[PDB]
Design a protein around this ligand. Sequence first.
Ligand SMILES: Nc1ncnc2c1ncn2[C@@H]1O[C@H](COP(=O)(O)OP(=O)(O)OP(=O)(O)O)[C@@H](O)[C@H]1O
Ligand SMILES: Nc1ncnc2c1ncn2[C@@H]1O[C@H](COP(=O)(O)OP(=O)(O)OP(=O)(O)O)[C@@H](O)[C@H]1O
Ligand SMILES: Cc1cn([C@H]2C[C@H](O)[C@@H](COP(=O)(O)OP(=O)(O)OP(=O)(O)O)O2)c(=O)[nH]c1=O
Ligand SMILES: [Mg+2]
Ligand SMILES: [Mg+2]
Ligand SMILES: [Mn+2]
Ligand SMILES: [Mn+2]
Ligand SMILES: [Mn+2]
Ligand SMILES: [Mn+2]
Lengths: 289, 289, 683, 683
Amino acid sequence: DFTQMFYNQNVKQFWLPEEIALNGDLLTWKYLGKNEQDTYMKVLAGLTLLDTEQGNTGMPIVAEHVDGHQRKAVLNFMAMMENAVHAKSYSNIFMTLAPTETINEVFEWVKQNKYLQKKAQMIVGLYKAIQKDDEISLFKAMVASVYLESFLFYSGFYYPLYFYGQGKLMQSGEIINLILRDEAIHGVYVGLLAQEIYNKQTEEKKAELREFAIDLLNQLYENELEYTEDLYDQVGLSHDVKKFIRYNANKALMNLGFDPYFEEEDINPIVLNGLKATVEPLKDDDFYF
Amino acid sequence: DFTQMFYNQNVKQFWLPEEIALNGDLLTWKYLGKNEQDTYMKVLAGLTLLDTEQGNTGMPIVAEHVDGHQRKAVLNFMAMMENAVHAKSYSNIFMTLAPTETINEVFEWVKQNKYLQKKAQMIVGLYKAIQKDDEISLFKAMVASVYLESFLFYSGFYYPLYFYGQGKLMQSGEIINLILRDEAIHGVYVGLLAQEIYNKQTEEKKAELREFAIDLLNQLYENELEYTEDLYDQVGLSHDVKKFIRYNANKALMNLGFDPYFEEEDINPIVLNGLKATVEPLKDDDFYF
Amino acid sequence: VPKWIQLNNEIMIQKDGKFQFDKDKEAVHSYFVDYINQNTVFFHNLKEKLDYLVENQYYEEEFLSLYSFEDIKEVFKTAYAKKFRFPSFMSAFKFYNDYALKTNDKKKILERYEDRISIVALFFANGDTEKAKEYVNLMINQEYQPSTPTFLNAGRKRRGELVSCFLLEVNDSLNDISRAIDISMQLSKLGGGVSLNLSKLRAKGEAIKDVENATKGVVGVMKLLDNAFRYADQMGQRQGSGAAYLNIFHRDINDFLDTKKISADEDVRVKTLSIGVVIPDKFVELAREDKAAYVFYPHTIYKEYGQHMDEMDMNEMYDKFVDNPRVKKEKINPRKLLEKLAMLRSESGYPYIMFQDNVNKVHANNHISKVKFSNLCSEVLQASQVSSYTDYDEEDEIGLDISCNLGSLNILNVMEHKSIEKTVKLATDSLTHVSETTDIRNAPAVRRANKAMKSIGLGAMNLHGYLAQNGIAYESPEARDFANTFFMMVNFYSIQRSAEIAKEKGETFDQYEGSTYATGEYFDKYVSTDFSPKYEKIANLFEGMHIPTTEDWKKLKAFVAEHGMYHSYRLCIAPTGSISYVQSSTASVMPIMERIEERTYGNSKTYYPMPGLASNNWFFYKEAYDMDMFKVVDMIATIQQHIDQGISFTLFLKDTMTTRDLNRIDLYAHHRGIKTIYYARTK
Amino acid sequence: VPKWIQLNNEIMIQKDGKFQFDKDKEAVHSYFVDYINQNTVFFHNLKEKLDYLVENQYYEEEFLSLYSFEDIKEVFKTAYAKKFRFPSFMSAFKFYNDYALKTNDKKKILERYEDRISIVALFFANGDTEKAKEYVNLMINQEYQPSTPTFLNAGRKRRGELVSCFLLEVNDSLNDISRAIDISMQLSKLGGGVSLNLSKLRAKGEAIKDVENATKGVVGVMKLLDNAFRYADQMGQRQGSGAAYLNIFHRDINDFLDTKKISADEDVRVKTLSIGVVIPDKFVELAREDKAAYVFYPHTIYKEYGQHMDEMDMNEMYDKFVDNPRVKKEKINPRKLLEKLAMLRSESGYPYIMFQDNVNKVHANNHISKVKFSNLCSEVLQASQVSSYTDYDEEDEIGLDISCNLGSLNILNVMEHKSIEKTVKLATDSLTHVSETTDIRNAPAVRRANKAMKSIGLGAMNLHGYLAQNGIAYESPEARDFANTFFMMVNFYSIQRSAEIAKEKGETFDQYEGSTYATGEYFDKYVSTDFSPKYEKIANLFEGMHIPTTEDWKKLKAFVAEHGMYHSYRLCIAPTGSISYVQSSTASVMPIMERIEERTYGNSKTYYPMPGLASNNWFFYKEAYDMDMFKVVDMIATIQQHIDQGISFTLFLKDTMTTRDLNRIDLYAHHRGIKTIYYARTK
Ligand SMILES: Nc1ncnc2c1ncn2[C@@H]1O[C@H](COP(=O)(O)OP(=O)(O)OP(=O)(O)O)[C@@H](O)[C@H]1O
Ligand SMILES: Nc1ncnc2c1ncn2[C@@H]1O[C@H](COP(=O)(O)OP(=O)(O)OP(=O)(O)O)[C@@H](O)[C@H]1O
Ligand SMILES: Cc1cn([C@H]2C[C@H](O)[C@@H](COP(=O)(O)OP(=O)(O)OP(=O)(O)O)O2)c(=O)[nH]c1=O
Ligand SMILES: [Mg+2]
Ligand SMILES: [Mg+2]
Ligand SMILES: [Mn+2]
Ligand SMILES: [Mn+2]
Ligand SMILES: [Mn+2]
Ligand SMILES: [Mn+2]
């Protein structure tokens, strides 16, 4: 009921890194404090590392196990955006703002970081556990994918959106907004594929899959809180970032056809500013009664 | 030395079938004989099948086994083109020119056609035989992919090109030329990756790989002859198409770094004829004169 | 999640294999003991409440000033003496979310059900305390329900208009088209659904003063009206809803239909404007005989004959149109057009189907005008005269644009109280009051038609609820017998009340003398045929009530001949969408779509069982989609024979059936005398 | 391929390294020897021709009946005595394809150039044979050219209105919005371009009858207007053209601008509605100082002050609006808004820019009203008063809606004949006649303002052609000196003719006594500054013509004080799209875009060199894109200092220059006193 519509929306959102000139960001970057520059670098590396997993494994593995030519095509398109567009865009932002040696060090740090690794490996673990012709394991991986696309990225997206909403780092913020817009539709689409599997299950199996999804969400959420304090306490933003995580967790759940887990909260206004029946001929004698 | 330039070429060649309006072909299509329309539908259906498998299976699987994020980005982009752009374009052509029943019948015809099933069996079999960290199985699949890109498509491409060259079906022909332009660069790129693996081998191993490549080519060739006769005898063109596929077989071999195998012949000359503004911020000195 | 939400969701949790319907009742209690009573605003006495609502611009002070405060207190005490309890959670929820008056910030509830009913009754009575008490007893017993505009807006300062539907005739001119757009925006601003007859507009490729192939046809006017309704969307609260009606013999009829095709281009597709097709008997005859039909260019016909194509009878003028060389026409296949109609209704539920000859063979006011189109709900079928809106500084010839006030009888409550006569007369009086106090200053034809026609619409709800709660299958002949008798009684007492109002006011509706009411023709079938129940069960159902016989109908005919009728039109059965929830009634005379409906509100989900659904009457509450549409057509025709206007007849189709089945249902409806078909809802 | 088309395409074929310009002349001969004479209907005498044209509803009887047949024959003989020959193929092709009268079957030519000129002259003179002969000599010398509406439709029964520029004020109400839509449709039906001021309309999220967040803003009104203009498209001949103007301090200004972005959705973008932005000096001051600006909600300002936001001076009102808590406003960056304007103009050439204070610091009728917006071509700048269109059966308050009368002097032909005074006065008389004979019965404010203001627009064209054929670069100071002198003489003789008409008829324009003409302020710069040429070459160009001095201007000021002025506005420089071809002239006062322009008609290619282009003046015919836009701004400001209304000023940009360069050109135009900027055409 939905793949051709998503095909259309995906292909009409096509874009390339070269379209946004990045150099003018240096005019606001130079005015940020060390903690602001440090947080931005770390957040950016976090997003980059997670998105690479999605391009190399997450999207291609789901495309492999999903049946249907049109679904495979949409999924291929999404994988292309991760690898050919998003990955180049993140690299471009980095190369503009930091010298080569600084980029290498930030990636070394974020690669060793406990909270980034915990979530990255949890997601990758579920992708590696998909078994041929087993729709339960596929569903679990789709849940992981939706959580990445619609939830885990947002502790990171917060900061570029926060600057973007203030008139700072506008070129890279525009790029991030385009990336985020792609991840939103990716999350919704994979969510619909997961609901299709979920709806084929018994009531007991459904309850079991719901428990899986909520348990996974809880593990990721508790790690996100730690990840958040680790990055954002030094710039005083953690309270507001936490509200943004919960709001996006609720969107991820709704993508999977589940009820919101967290109470509704208002979001930081600066970040908001950044954001056919069968045709049968009449046979005559149908006019007589 | 080459991936970056292929990346740039692939992304700059990006297109969608909807860019080309097809209603202009309606009259030249109406005017073709029943034999001509039948061959044309079947030819494009055979192409659709090849692109379906190249997009669903061939390109993603090669992407999985090839090392390097940039090489993977190129291969992922090529995969997307196969199933999200190329395979879909044929349906755009079908939906314009043909009634639903004729479309349904031709897709049923691909399922039961023995030559089309044999060629799919052979090519996809090699893709699915790739073993992780086994460069020889990967080479064999890359040879199969080059043969699909640079040889097997051409029994199909002949007919749209033959019409384009006579000023007939020129909108459909424009789509086909764009597809052909893509496959030419896809065949070169995969050919270069295959040569990388071949060049790592002992002379004895190389001799075996040439045997594999030539045996496979001959087996595919013999099947393609029967396919060509089956499609083209009713339009009187089988001998001409055969010359064309031999010509392109030599190009496939060359893409693999091998000498031409078939002698040169004169190809039908008809078929040969078938071939925002920059933004600066306002300074305070721009407000004074 | 709220406690009442959990209690309402406990219905579907089966106990001993049966639904827990009684849990629903518990929910209402919770909904009142945890939300409504806490969110209500209480005053020391009624005086402080009325003063606060008057000075804070919640209530109009004029209608309350006609009563002394003692009388208002007595009316409110009469309302609260019934101790009315909502039997289902959804009834109270719908009232307190859609109809109960809230504060400016919508944080508290100012109006209870009794308060709203008392205010509506005081507005209806217009200074009569006893009449106000009668209205209070009628509404608190839920025998009669004023329409959503009237019930929601009566006596309110910030109110809109009490009229639900408006029907506009658009003349073939740019001035008339612009005036129609303006009036549509004005009436959508007032909150009413606007229907426009586009059959007089000349088709695409017609001449505008001797330059040919110049007109955009009805599709351009359709786009203009669609944008007008999008702009005027009740201040962004409810999406602006419009209807366009076109005769099937209009040349643009295909393009018209192409506005609703799911593959239509953006320059043709229209999405906020419902479409209706008016089918004369000539089109059905041509399709039946498989003879190729002709659609006509209205402007050529107007030039040749001096009258519009829809202004005269196609059954007698179609051959003259075809044989006239000065009339331009296009060849069509009527069977292919019927199949296109069926396919469009399967895909999107459009167009509305209006069988023009079925409407006009029993239309009582053909002398004023024939009924050429219907309303947005395809149940209003009244005479309309097109207006001649001329240039600026020139006097406009104001015609008649249809507008009627809606009100529904609750069949279960009316028959339980054995008060068909009293309820019908009081509802007629309330609708007459609503018409009298309606004055629209931006729709001149609507105002003139309201003043002259005095047309009202008295509908009915809970037909299926009454039948299922009394052990009668909706498709059974006993149900049709009950509908025949009940609606003959309703028509009899509505005519009696109209004649009594005409006698007491000394005035009839305009041009009543030429109507079939004045000539006595309307009463023919009522003075020769007996409509008493033919089944003993139905007769027992009607016990304690005097069923009018042929002698009573003869006396009523003589009374009408002596005194006339105040209302040109009296009965029209509207869909009654959301106000049926508050009355604990099934929607209109249609069969129920589902026994228990799951509706999502906020982040919660609620289940509404059909009123009176239980184990013993589970299979009597047969779902509409599972029913034979031919027997539903039989029921609707049986009701329609006693309704002067139309009935919003929604077709309930299964996905398995084809467009041929839909066409067969449409043709059987036309054969059985169905005036209009509302929707083709597919399960 | 026809012979004349081959002879025209032979221009590009270079002989001896030079374009064969003279071959174009041969083409004209062929175009007349092979096509025009063969397809031209000939009559035995002019009496038979006039009888055939009148009887077959080609001409009007009224204007021909004012003359005896001898006088009409004498006028036609005077027209034909010139033996006028089109110098280029495109001139004759454009006339005989766009303006020459053709039969109903569009295969024969009924009107030659002399016939059309004679008919227009007879219409202008209104019964005076000598005046008709003067008009014939004026138009056959090609000194003056009536606009496309006047030239095409004068004397024709099957015609649109002679005015095609209409400016409408839209008041903040649904009645006023619907009336504006209706009037726009009626004026597009007449063939006119309609400009609507949307600044008085309240922004999105404003209150309607004290309900919050209800207004759709000006974007919904723009959607309605765009649909109305698409519907009304001159009976399917030309695409309906409309313009919407919004003040830059209106809050919707971004959404307004967002209607022209390519990325805008289908429910946001308007395709047939041009947009213009009115920029007061306050916005430019805020952007210059980089202070953050505020965009205001118009309805809150109206509620607080009783006047619309665009009706008061924002320079003195901006601080009070910002400091007023009851005025709702949103923070914006004026420099970001300027960059957005430049980017949008680069992408699509929109919006038009109106510098409000540049217009109003020299506006003579600020007492009537300040100029709040411009026309579709951004050159009409007049006082307008909004109308209060009330409900039905209620009297409307009719204001003033601008509709000026277009006509262009051919600077080359006027100056080579040494007839600035005579041509200006005769053109003023013809424009007065056409304004007096215009009667629009569906636009009340347009008709009232035409009767009261009597405003006409007398433009000029072939400025660059005249300068290039006289060895003067368009960007040279000598060109600006010539423009200063020529347009000061044009203004002098236009004012003199207006005062003479006022003295003869004994009446001035309404509210003239409050104008700067009456107080003598308008003549201040004319009684103190001498506008005689400062260069000997320009003085020799003006040889044989009396150049008004300061004493002459003092005498004219005294004459205006004694007798008044008949026209509220006299001069406006329109783009002059297709009439420049027929007159063999460069368009307006703009520099030429191309030296030789390539066009495709049917399946054939055609080549139009600029008039008088040769090897000697090839360098002086510099293309507009190659020119410095600052010097073009300087020339346009030099002309504008003598034009009471605006000048259609199109910017000509290269693809290399960025939005900073566009913003710099706009700010230099604002600094130099440019009133309007029309288009940003990128090469
Ligand atoms: N189903 C219902 N419909 C309408 N109002 C209700 C409903 N249930 C409770 N209420 C309101 O909430 C109050 C709670 O009282 P409840 O019905 O529990 O009985 P009570 O306290 O014994 O008094 P009473 O029934 O006589 O009003 C009611 O008096 C009434 O105002
Ligand atoms: N360049 C032109 N512009 C306008 N009309 C032209 C032109 N060339 C020819 N004609 C038309 O064709 C006619 C023939 O003109 P031609 O050059 O042959 O000689 P002529 O002496 O002007 O002729 P005639 O006896 O018609 O006056 C002209 O009278 C005129 O009507
Ligand atoms: C002006 C106009 C009219 N029409 C159509 C719609 C109207 O129903 C129809 C009548 O327009 P009218 O307003 O009646 O035009 P008219 O009176 O000048 O011409 P006539 O004498 O023939 O009546 O023309 C268009 O389609 N597009 C237009 O732009
Ligand atoms: Mg008319
Ligand atoms: Mg108002
Ligand atoms: Mn990504
Ligand atoms: Mn993604
Ligand atoms: Mn391909
Ligand atoms: Mn390929």
